[PDB]
Task: inverse folding
């Protein structure tokens, strides 16, 4: 029996008997141990993939949305709103539907994967596509929630992060201690901040004896945290993190500093390589943005900056089905052949 | 948190200590209690959605593939093959990658959802598109495996059904007994056969006191089990079940008969209605084919054929992200507007 995330960690969340539990049964995702890569195995470095693509709406956002929406409804909210590169919008839409309230999502025109758009569509969210990027959308949405009785459910809402910190809890619960390293993508920066919050809380509770080094990775075309200043024209095929001015900037920096980790850039080429590696070699399909976490691991490995005899946990943020269009970038679909055995056997390379 | 499905039910599966466990941590999916529909609630009827869309590759096929591939490898197989409408192929591809062997998938050109094609592509399967339908693909693929040393992983392989029967096990483990009714879509007929196998087994072992009435449903345009004869030209927007000559025909008929259930048809229009309902009302996004199960429940509720105060479990077979293209037929995507607050507030219907 898979429990609502809010119930699994009720004692560690800002809820009470008065809180309406709006759950689609999120969290408690699998922690898949990885075979390699060989580059890691030879150094006594093993990897685990926290597969967040198996959350109800396909991404880790559900962890924060369940709490955010539940608390909003508790406060009487009739509607919720959020700007998004796709996943937060899909999550807000699904939970709003579950709760029976209105969901308004603002998206950057042309920079949202088809899977995500399809989700906001089908779940019935009121969609607004703006002729601008995510950063513009976020600025606009916050102003919208200041002029109308609509609950803002973007990461700036504390409940989003309190809910997402549970990912750290689950890793420790399963492994018995926090890992030496925890890698994940960084877009608006709420997740890296939530992970660290989770690890610190569990360490204070004594459930984790050690504190992991947080390894955050941004796409080279949208790496404000890496360059040290906002990026006016963020660019990258991993549109989930096509973000130039992260709202949790300070949270990310502190997480990096406090944990002794890093926040670095990986190229779109490196993202595609890791993306293909996970799917073709480990049998795990995550969207490009998520693959950035693995790309980061590959990077530090090749540079000898990951200590031997360590456990590395990767947070694969979203399922690959979120963005099917990118598959054609790492593989080719063979043209159709006649429905005759001969043609099939040849096409299958069995002749 | 999720153990390999093979381990969870090791004692009830055809495995031993020498069986290589090829797992992506499948099974143990959530059983979501549905809010309605209203017609059900009025009769005290409760519905639960076994969300198979949360399996590693997004469909229930993983249940069968983990066993089929594990046993294939145990037999020394270097490759597996299967004809598919999309999901079985995606599953085979992912597990093949996991095990490190070859996966050959035969698909009907033009009739496999975008999400599914992306999966077989990215996971590295050797793809063959035939200018014919699924039925043709299965016929040709079986011939292939009768000649070549490639293990067939289609539902005709008994291991697929043994793996898939575990879904019934899980429902009983969680609910405490088998439900009064269990609805699911019927395409090639392997799943309904497997479901019944599972419930009978658990009932014989005393784990379940009752036996559910199996409710299978087919798309009106591809309903050979409803018409009583093979459908030469199956057609439906729910391409997953665009099948005219189910391989497990007798298995389906026997499950229907023995359980005291039925196998009826639902129109594409009714499928879209249930598809929209689940996503917009329950917050659950499943592909059209999966929605056929709910359409079937609406059908019987409407005909007053479900006992009041009964428990109904639905197997939502695949995640909606599998087929993003269909979203656009239940909702409209509004055109982009300027990145200005006023344009946004108006577009959001707030002014
Ligand atoms: C898949 C993925 N990965 C990764 C990432 C990064 O994370 P962060 O935490 O750093 O951000 C993302 C984002 N996302 C988003 C973002 C923005 C919004 P919010 O509220 O969430 O912040 C959406 O929308 O979807 C995604 O989507
Ligand atoms: C989502 C879904 N649902 C439902 C169905 C129906 O089921 P069945 O069991 O009755 O069949 C299907 C199919 N599927 C398939 C089929 C054929 C193959 P096999 O081997 O699996 O049989 C694929 O491919 O994917 C799908 O996909």
Result:
């Amino acid at each position: 029996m898979r429990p609502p995330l809010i119930e699994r960690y009720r004692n560690l969340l800002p809820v009470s008997e008065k809180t309406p539990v709006i759950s689609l049964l999120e969290g408690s995702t699998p922690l898949i141990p990885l075979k390699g890569p060989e580059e890691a195995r030879k150094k006594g470095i093993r990897l685990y993939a926290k597969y967040e693509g198996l959350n109800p709406t396909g991404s880790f956002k559900d962890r924060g949305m369940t709490l955010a929406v539940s608390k909003a409804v508790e406060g009487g909210a009739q509607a919720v709103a959020c700007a998004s590169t796709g996943n937060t919008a899909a999550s807000a839409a699904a939970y709003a539907a579950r709760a029976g309230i209105l969901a308004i999502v603002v998206l950057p025109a042309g920079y949202v994967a088809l899977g995500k758009v399809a989700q906001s569509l089908v779940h019935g969210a009121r969609i607004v596509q703006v002729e601008g990027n995510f950063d513009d959308a976020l600025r606009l949405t916050q102003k919208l929630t200041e002029a109308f009785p609509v609950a803002l459910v973007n990461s700036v809402n504390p409940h989003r992060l309190e809910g997402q910190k549970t990912l750290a809890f689950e890793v420790v619960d399963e492994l018995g201690d926090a890992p030496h390293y925890h890698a994940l993508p960084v877009g608006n920066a709420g997740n890296i901040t939530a992970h660290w919050m989770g690890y610190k809380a569990y360490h204070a509770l004594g459930k984790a004896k050690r504190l992991p080094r947080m390894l955050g990775f941004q796409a080279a075309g949208a790496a404000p945290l890496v360059l040290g200043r906002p990026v006016e024209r963020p660019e990258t095929l991993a549109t989930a993190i096509r973000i130039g001015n992260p709202a949790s900037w300070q949270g990310a920096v502190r997480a990096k500093e406090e944990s002794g980790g890093v926040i670095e850039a990986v190229t779109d080429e490196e993202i595609l390589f890791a993306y293909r590696y996970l799917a073709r070699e480990e049998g795990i399909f995550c969207e490009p943005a998520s693959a950035a976490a693995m790309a980061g691991v590959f990077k530090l490995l090749r540079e000898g900056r990951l200590e031997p005899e360590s456990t590395v946990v990767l947070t694969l943020t979203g399922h690959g089905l979120k963005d099917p269009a990118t598959a054609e970038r790492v593989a080719e679909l063979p043209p159709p052949v006649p429905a005759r055995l001969e043609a099939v056997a040849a096409a299958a390379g069995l002749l």
Notes: The pocket of HEY (ligand 1) is lined by residues A 59, 61, 82, 84-89, 154-155, 185-192, 240-241, 247, 287, 289-290, 317-318 (CB under 6 Å). Chain A touches chain B through 91 residues (CB under 8 Å). Residues 46 and 311 of chain A are 5 Å apart (CA to CA). The longest helix of chain A spans residues 190-204.
